Tab-separated table of C-alpha atoms and ligand atoms in Angstrom:
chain	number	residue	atom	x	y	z
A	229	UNK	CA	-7.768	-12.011	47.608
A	230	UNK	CA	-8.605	-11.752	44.093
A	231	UNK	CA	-5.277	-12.614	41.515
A	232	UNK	CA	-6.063	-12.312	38.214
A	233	UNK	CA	-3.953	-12.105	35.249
A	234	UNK	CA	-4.023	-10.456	31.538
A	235	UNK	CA	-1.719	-11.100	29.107
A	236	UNK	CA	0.243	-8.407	26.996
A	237	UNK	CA	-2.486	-8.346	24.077
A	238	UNK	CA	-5.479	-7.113	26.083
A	239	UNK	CA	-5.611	-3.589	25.544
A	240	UNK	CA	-5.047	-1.494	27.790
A	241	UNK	CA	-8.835	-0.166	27.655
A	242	UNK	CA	-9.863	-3.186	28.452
A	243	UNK	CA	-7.643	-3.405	30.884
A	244	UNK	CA	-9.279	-0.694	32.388
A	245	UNK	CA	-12.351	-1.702	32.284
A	246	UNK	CA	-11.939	-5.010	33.211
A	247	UNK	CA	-9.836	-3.519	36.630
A	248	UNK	CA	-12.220	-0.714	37.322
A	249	UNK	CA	-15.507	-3.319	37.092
A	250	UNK	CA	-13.543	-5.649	39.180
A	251	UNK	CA	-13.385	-2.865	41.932
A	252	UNK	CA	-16.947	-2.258	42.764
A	253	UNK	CA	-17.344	-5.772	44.335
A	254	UNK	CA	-14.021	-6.573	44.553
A	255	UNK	CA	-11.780	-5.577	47.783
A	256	UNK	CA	-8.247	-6.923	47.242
A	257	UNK	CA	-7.361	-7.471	43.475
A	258	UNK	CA	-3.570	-8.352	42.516
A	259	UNK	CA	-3.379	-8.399	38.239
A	260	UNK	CA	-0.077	-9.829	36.461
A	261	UNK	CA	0.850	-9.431	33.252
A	262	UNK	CA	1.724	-12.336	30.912
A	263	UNK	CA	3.016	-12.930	27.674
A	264	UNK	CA	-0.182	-14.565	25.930
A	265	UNK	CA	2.543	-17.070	24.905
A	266	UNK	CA	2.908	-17.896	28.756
A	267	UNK	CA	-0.744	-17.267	29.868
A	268	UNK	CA	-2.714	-20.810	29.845
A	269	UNK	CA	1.111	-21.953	31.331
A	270	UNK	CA	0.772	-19.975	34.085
A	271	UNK	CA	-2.866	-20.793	34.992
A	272	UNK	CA	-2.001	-24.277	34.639
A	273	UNK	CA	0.401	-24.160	37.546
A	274	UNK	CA	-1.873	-25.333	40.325
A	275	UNK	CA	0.433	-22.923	42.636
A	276	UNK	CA	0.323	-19.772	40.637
A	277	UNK	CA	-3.159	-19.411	42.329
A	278	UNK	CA	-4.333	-17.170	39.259
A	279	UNK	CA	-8.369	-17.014	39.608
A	280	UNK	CA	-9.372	-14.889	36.497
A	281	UNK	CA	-7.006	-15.279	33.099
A	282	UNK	CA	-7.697	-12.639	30.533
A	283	UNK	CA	-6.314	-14.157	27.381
A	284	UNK	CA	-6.400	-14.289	23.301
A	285	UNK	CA	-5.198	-17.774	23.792
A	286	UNK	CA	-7.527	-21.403	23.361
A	287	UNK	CA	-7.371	-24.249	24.864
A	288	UNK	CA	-10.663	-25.675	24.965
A	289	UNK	CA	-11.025	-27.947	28.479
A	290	UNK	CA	-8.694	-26.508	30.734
A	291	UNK	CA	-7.934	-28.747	34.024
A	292	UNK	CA	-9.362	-26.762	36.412
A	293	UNK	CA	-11.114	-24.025	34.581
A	294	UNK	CA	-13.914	-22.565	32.424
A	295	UNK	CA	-13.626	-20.632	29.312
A	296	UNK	CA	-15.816	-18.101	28.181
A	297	UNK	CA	-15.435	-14.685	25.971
A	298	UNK	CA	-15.525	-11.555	27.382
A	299	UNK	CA	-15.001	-9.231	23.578
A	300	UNK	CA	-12.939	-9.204	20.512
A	301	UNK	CA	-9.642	-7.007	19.403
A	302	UNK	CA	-7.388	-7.022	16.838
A	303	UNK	CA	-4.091	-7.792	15.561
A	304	UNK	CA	-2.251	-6.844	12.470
A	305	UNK	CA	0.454	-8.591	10.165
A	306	UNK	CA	3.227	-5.570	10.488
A	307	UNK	CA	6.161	-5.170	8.856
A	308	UNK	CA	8.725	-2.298	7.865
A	309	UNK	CA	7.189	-0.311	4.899
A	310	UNK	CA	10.300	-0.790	2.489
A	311	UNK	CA	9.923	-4.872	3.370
A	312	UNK	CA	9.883	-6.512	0.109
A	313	UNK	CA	6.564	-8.379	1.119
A	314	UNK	CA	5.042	-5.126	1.710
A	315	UNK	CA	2.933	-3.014	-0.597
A	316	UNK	CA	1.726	-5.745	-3.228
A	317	UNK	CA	0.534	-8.918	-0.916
A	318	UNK	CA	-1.498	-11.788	-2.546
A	319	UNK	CA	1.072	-13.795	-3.233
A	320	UNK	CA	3.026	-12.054	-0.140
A	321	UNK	CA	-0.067	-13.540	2.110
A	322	UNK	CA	1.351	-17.112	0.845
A	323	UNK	CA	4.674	-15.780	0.821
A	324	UNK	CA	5.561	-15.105	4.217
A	325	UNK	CA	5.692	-18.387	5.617
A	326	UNK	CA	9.097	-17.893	3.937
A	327	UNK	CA	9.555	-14.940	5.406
A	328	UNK	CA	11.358	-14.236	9.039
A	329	UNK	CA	8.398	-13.668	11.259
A	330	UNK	CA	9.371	-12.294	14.494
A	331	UNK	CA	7.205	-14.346	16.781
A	332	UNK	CA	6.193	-14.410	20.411
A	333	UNK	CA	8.856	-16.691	22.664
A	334	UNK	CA	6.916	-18.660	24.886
A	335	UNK	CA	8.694	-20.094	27.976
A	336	UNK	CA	7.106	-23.264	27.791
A	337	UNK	CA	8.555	-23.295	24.339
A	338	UNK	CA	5.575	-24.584	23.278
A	339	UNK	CA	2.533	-22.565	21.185
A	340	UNK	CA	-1.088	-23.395	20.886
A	341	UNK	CA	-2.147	-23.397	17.581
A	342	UNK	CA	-3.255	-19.796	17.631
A	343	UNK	CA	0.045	-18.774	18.705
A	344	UNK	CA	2.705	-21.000	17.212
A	345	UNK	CA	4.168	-19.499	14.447
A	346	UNK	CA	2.948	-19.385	10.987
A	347	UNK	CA	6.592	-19.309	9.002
A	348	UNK	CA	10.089	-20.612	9.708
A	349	UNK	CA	12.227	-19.308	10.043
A	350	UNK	CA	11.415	-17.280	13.314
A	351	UNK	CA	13.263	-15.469	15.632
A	352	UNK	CA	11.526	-15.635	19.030
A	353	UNK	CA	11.192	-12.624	21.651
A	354	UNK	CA	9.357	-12.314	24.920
A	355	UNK	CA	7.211	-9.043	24.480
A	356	UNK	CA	5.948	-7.119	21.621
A	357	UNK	CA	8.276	-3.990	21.992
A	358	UNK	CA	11.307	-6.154	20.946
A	359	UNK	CA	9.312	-7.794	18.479
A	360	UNK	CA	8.342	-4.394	17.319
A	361	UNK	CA	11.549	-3.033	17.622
A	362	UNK	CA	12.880	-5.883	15.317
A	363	UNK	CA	10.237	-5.201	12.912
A	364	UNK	CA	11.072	-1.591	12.173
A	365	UNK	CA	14.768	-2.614	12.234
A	366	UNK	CA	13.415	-4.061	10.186
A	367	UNK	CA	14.376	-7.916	10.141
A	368	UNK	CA	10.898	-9.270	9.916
A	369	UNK	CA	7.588	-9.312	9.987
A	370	UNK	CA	5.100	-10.052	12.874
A	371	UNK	CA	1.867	-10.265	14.459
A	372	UNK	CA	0.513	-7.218	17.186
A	373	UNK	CA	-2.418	-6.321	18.755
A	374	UNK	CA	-4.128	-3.051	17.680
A	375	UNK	CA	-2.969	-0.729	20.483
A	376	UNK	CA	0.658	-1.521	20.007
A	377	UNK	CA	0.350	-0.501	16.697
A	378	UNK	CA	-1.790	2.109	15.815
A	379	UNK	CA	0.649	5.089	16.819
A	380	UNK	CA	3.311	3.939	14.719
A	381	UNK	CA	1.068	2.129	12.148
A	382	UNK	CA	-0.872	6.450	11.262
A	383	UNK	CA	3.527	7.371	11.266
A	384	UNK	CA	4.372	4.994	8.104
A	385	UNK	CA	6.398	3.810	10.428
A	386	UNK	CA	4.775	0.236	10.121
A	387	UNK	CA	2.941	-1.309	7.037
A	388	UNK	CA	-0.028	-3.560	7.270
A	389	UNK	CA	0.629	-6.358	5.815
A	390	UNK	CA	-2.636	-8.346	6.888
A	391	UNK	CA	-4.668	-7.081	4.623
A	392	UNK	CA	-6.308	-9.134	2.230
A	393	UNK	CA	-6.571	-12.175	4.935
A	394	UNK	CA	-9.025	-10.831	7.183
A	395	UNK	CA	-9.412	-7.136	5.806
A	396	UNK	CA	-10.013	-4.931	8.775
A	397	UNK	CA	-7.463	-6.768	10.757
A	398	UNK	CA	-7.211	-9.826	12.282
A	399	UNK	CA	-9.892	-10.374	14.542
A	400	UNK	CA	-9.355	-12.002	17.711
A	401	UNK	CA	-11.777	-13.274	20.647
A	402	UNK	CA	-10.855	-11.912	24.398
A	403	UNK	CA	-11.387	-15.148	26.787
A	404	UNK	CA	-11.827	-15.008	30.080
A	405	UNK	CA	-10.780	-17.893	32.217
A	406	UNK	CA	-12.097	-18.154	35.666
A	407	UNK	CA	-11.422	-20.762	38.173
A	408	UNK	CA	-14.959	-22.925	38.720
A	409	UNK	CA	-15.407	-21.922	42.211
A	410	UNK	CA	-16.152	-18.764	41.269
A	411	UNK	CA	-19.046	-19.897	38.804
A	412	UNK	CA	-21.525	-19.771	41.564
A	413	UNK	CA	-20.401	-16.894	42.944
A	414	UNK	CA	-22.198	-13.821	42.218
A	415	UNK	CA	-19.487	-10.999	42.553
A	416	UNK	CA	-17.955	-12.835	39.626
A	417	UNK	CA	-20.997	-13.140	37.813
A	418	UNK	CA	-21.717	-9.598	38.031
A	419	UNK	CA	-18.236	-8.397	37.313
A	420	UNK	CA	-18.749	-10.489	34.445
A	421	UNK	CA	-21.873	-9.050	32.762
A	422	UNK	CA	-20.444	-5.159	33.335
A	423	UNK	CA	-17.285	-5.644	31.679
A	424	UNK	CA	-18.926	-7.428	29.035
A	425	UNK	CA	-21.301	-4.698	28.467
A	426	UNK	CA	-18.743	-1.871	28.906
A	427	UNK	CA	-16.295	-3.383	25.974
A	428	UNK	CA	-19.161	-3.888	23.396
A	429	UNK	CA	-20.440	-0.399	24.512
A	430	UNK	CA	-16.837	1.182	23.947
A	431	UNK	CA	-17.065	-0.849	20.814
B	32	UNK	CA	-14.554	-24.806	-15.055
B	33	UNK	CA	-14.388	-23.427	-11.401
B	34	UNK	CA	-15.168	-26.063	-8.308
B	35	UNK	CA	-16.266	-24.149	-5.724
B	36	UNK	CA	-17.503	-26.285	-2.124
B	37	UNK	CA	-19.532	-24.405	0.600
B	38	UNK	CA	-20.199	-25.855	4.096
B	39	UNK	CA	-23.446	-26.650	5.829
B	40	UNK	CA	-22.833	-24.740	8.013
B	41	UNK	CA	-22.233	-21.122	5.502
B	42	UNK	CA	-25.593	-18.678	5.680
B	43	UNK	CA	-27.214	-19.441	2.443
B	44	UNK	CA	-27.499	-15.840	2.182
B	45	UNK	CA	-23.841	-15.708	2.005
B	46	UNK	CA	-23.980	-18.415	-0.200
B	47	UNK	CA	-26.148	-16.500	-2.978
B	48	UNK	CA	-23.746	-13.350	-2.505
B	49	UNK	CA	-20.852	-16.015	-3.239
B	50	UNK	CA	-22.755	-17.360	-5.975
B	51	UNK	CA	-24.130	-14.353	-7.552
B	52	UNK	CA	-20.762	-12.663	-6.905
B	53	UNK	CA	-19.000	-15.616	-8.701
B	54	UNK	CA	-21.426	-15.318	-12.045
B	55	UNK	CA	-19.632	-11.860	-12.564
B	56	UNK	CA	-16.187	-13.335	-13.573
B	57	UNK	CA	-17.285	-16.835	-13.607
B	58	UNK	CA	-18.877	-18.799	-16.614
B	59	UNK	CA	-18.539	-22.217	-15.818
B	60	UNK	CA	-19.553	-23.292	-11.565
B	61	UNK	CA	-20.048	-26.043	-9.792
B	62	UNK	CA	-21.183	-26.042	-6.170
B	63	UNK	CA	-20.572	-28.804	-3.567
B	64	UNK	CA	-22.173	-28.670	-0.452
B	65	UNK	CA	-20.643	-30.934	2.079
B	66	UNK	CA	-20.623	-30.784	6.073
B	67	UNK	CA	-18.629	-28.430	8.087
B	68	UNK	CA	-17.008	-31.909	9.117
B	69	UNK	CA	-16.425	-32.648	5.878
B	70	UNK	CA	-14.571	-29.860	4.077
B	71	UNK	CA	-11.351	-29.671	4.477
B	72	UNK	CA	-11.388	-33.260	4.512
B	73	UNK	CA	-12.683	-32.788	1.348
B	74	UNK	CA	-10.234	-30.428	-0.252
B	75	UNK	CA	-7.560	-32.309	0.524
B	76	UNK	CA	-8.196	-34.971	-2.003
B	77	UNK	CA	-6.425	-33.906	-4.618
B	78	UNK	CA	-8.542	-35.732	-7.166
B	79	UNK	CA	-11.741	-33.927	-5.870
B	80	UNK	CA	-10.291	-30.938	-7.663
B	81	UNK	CA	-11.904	-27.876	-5.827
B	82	UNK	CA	-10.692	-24.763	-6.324
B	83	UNK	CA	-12.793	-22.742	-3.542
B	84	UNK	CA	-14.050	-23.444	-0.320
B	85	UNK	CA	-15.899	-21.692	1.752
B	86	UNK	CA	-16.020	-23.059	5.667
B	87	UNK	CA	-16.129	-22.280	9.386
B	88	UNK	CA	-13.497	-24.893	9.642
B	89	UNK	CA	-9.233	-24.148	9.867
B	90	UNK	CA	-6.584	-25.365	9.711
B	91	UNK	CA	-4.036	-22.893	9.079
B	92	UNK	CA	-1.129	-24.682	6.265
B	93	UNK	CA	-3.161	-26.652	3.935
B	94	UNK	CA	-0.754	-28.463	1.557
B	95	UNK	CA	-2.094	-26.572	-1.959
B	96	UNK	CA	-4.246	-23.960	-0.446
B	97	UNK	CA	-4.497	-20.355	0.921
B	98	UNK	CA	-7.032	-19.599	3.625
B	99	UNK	CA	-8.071	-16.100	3.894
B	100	UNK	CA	-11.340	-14.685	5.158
B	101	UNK	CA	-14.859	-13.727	4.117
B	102	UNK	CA	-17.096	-13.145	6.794
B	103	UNK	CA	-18.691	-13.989	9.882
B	104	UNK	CA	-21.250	-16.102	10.834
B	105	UNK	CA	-23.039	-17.230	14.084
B	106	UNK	CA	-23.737	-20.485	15.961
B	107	UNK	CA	-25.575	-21.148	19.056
B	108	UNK	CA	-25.581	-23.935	21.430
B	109	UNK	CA	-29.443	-24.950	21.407
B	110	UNK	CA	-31.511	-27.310	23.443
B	111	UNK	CA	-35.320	-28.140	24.070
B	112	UNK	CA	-36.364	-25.827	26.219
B	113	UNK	CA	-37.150	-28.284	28.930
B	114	UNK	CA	-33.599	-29.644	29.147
B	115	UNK	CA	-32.037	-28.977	32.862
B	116	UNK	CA	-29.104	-27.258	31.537
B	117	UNK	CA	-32.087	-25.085	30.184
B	118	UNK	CA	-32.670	-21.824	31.759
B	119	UNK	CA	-30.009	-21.618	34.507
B	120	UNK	CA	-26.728	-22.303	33.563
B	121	UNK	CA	-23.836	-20.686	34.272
B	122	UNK	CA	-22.775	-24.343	36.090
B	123	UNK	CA	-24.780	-25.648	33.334
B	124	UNK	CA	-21.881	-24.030	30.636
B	125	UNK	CA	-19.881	-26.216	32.499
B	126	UNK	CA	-21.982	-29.267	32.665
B	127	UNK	CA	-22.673	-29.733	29.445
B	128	UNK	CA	-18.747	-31.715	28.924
B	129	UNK	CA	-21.339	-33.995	30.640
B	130	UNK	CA	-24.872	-34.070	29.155
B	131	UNK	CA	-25.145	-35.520	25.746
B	132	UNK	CA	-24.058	-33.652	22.488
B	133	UNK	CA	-25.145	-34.123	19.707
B	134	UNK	CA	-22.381	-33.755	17.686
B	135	UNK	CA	-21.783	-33.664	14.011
B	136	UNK	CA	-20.277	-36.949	11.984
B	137	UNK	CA	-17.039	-36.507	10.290
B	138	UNK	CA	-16.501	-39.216	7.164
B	139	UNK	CA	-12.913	-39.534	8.195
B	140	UNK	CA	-14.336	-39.509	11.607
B	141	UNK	CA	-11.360	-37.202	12.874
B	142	UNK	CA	-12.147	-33.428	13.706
B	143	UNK	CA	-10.354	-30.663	14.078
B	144	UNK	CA	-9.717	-28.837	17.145
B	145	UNK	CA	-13.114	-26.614	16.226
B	146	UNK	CA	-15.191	-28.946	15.199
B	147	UNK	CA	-14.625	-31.628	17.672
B	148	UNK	CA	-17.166	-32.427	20.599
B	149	UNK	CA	-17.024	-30.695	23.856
B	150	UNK	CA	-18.600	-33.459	25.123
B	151	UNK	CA	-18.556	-37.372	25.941
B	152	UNK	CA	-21.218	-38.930	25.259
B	153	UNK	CA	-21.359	-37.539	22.256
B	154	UNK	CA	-24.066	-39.455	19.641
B	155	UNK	CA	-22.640	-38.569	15.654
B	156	UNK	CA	-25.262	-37.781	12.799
B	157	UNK	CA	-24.187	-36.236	9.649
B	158	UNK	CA	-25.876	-33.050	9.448
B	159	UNK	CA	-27.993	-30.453	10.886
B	160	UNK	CA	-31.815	-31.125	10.507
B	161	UNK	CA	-30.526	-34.809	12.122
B	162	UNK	CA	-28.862	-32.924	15.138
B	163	UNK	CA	-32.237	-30.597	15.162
B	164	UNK	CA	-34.925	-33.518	14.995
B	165	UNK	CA	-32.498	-35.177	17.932
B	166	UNK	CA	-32.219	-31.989	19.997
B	167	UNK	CA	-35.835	-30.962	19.877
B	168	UNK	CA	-37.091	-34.293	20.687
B	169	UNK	CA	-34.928	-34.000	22.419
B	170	UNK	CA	-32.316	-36.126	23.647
B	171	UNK	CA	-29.266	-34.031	23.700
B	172	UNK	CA	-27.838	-30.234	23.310
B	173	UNK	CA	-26.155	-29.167	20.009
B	174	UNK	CA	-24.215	-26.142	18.228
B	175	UNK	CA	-26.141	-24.801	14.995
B	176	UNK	CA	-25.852	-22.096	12.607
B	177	UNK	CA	-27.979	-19.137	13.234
B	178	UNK	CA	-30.305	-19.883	10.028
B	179	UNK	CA	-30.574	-23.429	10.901
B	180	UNK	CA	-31.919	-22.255	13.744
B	181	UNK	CA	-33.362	-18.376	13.881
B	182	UNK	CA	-37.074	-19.825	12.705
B	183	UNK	CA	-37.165	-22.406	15.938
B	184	UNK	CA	-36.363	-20.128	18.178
B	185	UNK	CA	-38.558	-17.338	17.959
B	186	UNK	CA	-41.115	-20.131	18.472
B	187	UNK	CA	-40.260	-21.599	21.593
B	188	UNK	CA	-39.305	-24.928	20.212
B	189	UNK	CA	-35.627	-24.491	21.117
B	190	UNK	CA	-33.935	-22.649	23.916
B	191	UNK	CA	-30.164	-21.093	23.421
B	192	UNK	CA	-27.755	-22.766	26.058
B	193	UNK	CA	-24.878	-20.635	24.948
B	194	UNK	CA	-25.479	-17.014	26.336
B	195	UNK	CA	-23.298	-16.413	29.131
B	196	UNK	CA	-20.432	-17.966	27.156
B	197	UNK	CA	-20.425	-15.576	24.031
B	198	UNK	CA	-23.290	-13.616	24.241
B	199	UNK	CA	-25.042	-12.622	21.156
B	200	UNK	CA	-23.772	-16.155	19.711
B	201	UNK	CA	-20.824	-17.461	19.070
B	202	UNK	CA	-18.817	-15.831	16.474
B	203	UNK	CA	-17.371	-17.775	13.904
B	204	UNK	CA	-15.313	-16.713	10.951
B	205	UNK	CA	-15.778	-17.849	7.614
B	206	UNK	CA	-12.921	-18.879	5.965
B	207	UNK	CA	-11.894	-19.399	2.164
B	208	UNK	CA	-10.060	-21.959	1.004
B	209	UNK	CA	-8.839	-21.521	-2.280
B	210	UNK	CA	-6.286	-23.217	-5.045
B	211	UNK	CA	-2.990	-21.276	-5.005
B	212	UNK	CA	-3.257	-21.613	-8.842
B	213	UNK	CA	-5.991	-18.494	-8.385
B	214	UNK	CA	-3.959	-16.318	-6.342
B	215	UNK	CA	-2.374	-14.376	-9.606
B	216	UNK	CA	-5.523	-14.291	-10.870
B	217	UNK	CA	-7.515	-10.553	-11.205
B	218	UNK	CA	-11.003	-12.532	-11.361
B	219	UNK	CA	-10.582	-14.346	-8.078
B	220	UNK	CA	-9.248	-10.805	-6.572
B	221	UNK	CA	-12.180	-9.069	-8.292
B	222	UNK	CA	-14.828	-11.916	-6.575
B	223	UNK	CA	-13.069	-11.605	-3.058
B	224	UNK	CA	-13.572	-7.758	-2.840
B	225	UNK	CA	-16.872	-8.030	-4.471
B	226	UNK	CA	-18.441	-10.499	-2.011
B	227	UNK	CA	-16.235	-9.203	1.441
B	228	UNK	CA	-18.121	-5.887	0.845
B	229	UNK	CA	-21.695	-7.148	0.144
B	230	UNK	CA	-21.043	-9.363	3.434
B	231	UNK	CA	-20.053	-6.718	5.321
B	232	UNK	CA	-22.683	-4.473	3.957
B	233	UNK	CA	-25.283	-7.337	5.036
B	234	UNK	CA	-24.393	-7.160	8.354
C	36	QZN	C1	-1.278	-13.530	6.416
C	36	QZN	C2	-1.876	-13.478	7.811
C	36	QZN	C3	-1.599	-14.766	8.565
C	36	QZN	C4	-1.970	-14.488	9.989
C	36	QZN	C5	-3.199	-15.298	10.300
C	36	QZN	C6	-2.917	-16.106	11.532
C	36	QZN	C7	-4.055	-15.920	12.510
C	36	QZN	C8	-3.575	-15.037	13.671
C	36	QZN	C9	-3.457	-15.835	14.981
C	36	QZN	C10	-2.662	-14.947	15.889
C	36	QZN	N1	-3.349	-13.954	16.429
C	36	QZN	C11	-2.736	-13.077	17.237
C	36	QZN	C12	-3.480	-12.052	17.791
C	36	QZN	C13	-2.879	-11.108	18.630
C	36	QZN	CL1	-3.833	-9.785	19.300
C	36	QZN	C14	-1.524	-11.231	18.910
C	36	QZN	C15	-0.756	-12.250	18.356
C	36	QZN	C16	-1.368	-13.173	17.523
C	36	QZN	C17	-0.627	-14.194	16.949
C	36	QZN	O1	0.567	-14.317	17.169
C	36	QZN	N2	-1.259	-15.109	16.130
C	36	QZN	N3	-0.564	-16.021	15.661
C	37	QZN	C1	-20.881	-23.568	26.324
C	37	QZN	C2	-20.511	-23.268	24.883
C	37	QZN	C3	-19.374	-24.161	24.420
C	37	QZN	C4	-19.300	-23.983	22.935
C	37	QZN	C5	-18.020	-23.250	22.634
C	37	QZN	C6	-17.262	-24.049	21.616
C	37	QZN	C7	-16.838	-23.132	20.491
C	37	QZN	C8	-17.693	-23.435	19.253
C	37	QZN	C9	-16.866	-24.097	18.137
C	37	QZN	C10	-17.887	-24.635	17.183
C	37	QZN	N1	-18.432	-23.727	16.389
C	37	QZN	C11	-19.380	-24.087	15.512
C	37	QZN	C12	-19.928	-23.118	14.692
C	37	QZN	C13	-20.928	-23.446	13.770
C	37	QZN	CL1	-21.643	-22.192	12.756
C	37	QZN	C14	-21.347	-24.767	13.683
C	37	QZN	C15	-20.814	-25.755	14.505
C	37	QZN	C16	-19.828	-25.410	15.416
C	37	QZN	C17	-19.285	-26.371	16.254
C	37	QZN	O1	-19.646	-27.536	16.206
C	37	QZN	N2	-18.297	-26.008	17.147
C	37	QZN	N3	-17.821	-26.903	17.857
């Protein structure tokens, strides 16, 4: 038995992808689904028993684990179109650490560097509806993945703020932490090499 | 008079399209190469007065700076092809915490989070022709740019460790660093456009 988790900003393509590939030489498969905030926490538990984490989070040397990338996504700086950061930015991309950013809660209460939040102050949820929610409230602004986004974003429902950093959106590496007993294994290493072939195909 | 510092590690390519970019707006530049290592280090004295930099390196709040990005770039872990970690090496991603890096020197001899060695023993040097003679003679495994590196390769001289993490090479984003005195200012807005779009139009 095969647990495996993904966190909340893997989308759900990949999700796909990642579950269907799993399936052809995998027989018993349980996934949970993290905040990316609690991810790396939850593999770190040595009872959680997670054997695959599929994460946007880093943490280079990880106890009992090995990193390595499986494909790239991307996030966007959102906020409500009539925010006054929105429209006219350069300044606004210095601006909003000043700003309420509606950030990602993490239970640990404590961020990696590529999650802890940029401004203060924040307001911290667990999941990226209420921090969406919030957003089109709208009391601040906040970081999404793609997918989250994109329905609302073609609306004018949502503004990208995120521009002029990183124009394009914000783009963000998929890892893929396995648990070093499977590194020999060749189910694992197979599974491996489709996935990553299917995501750069879909790309 | 417009300071303007570009890392080792920056594709020089992307450092004439920054430079002849620059020459539009720009009458007066200087150009400071330092080491990745280096940089940021580097733009933090405030007496060293720079006013740009472009580097793989981050650090998200700089004190009088905005980060943004320009482009990416790509690095590869390399070794002589007769290392053991050479050819098969899916362990061998993991083994290397344990074979020798060599690593790149930092002045203040502190690194960031990206720039710090995976692994212990790690032997320092100060730039990337030193970690090349090293690792082709070769007594350890290091990461290089691509260009540092693209000429070696096709040779046979080196071997690329770093394909089943990453595959394709690592991606790295290259980030700007510049003075929040130029973020007002049309010419620095005109350059950023200017040289995203020739970047992206490289790839
Ligand atoms: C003016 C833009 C400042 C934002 C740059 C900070 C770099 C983003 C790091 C980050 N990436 C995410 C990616 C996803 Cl898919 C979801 C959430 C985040 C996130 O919260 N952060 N912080
Ligand atoms: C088995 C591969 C482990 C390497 C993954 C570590 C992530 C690389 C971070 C890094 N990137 C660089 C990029 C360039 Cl262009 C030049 C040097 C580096 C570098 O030294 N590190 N550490």
């Amino acid at each position: 038995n095969l647990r495996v988790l993904l966190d909340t900003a893997i989308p759900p393509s990949f999700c796909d992808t990642v579950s269907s590939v799993l399936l052809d030489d995998f027989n018993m498969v349980s996934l949970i689904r993290t905040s990316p905030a609690d991810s790396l926490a939850t593999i770190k538990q040595d009872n959680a028993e997670i054997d695959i984490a599929i994460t946007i989070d880093e943490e280079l040397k990880i106890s009992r684990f090995n990193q390595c990338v499986l494909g790239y996504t991307k996030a966007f700086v959102v906020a409500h179109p009539q925010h006054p950061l929105c429209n006219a930015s350069l300044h606004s991309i210095a601006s909003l650490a000043n700003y309420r950013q509606i950030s990602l809660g993490s239970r640990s209460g404590q961020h990696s560097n590529l999650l802890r939040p940029v401004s203060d102050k924040v307001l911290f949820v667990e999941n990226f509806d209420d921090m969406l929610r919030l957003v089109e409230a709208g009391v601040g602004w906040g970081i999404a993945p793609h997918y989250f986004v994109e329905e609302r974003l073609r609306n004018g429902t949502l503004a990208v703020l995120s521009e002029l950093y990183e124009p394009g959106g914000i783009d963000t590496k998929v890892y893929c932490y396995y648990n070093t007993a499977l590194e020999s294994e060749r189910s694992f290493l197979r599974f491996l090499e489709s996935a990553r072939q299917r995501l750069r195909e879909l790309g």
